[PDB]
């Protein structure tokens, strides 16, 4: 139908090559234009999305919704749907040295994220 052709099929889709070192910050910055606040929220969002303390999905969602002031739920869900891509590819994009990139790539493979590396590198 016509409505379906007026927007993308999946508003949450983001290809691995799109996630540069500042992709997350730019998504947040559209809602929070202040440089300091958007950077704080980027740091916090990465920590939340990583699920590091063990964290359940319900907890990730709760914390992210509060981070976004109980608004912007579509952005919140987009980030959660892409949590592995956002966390890992942001980290990888920020890694300059051979050793650090290698470490990250091995860790991604160990986490079952070969699919993301295949997307990024072909």
Automatic annotation (TrEMBL):
<protein>
    <recommendedName>
        <fullName>RNA helicase</fullName>
    </recommendedName>
</protein>
């Amino acid at each position: 139908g016509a409505m379906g052709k007026s927007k993308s099929q999946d508003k949450n889709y983001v290809h691995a090559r799109e996630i540069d070192a500042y992709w997350l910050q730019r998504q947040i910055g559209r809602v929070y234009p202040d440089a300091h606040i958007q950077h704080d929220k980027t740091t916090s969002a990465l920590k939340i999305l990583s699920g590091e303390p063990e964290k359940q999905l319900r907890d990730i969602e709760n914390d992210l919704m509060e981070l976004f002031d109980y608004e912007h739920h579509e952005l919140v869900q987009k980030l959660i749907e892409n949590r592995d891509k956002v966390v890992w590819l942001t980290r990888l994009a920020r890694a300059e040295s051979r050793e650090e990139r290698d470490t990250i790539e091995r860790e991604m493979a160990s986490e079952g994220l070969r699919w993301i590396l295949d997307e990024l590198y072909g």
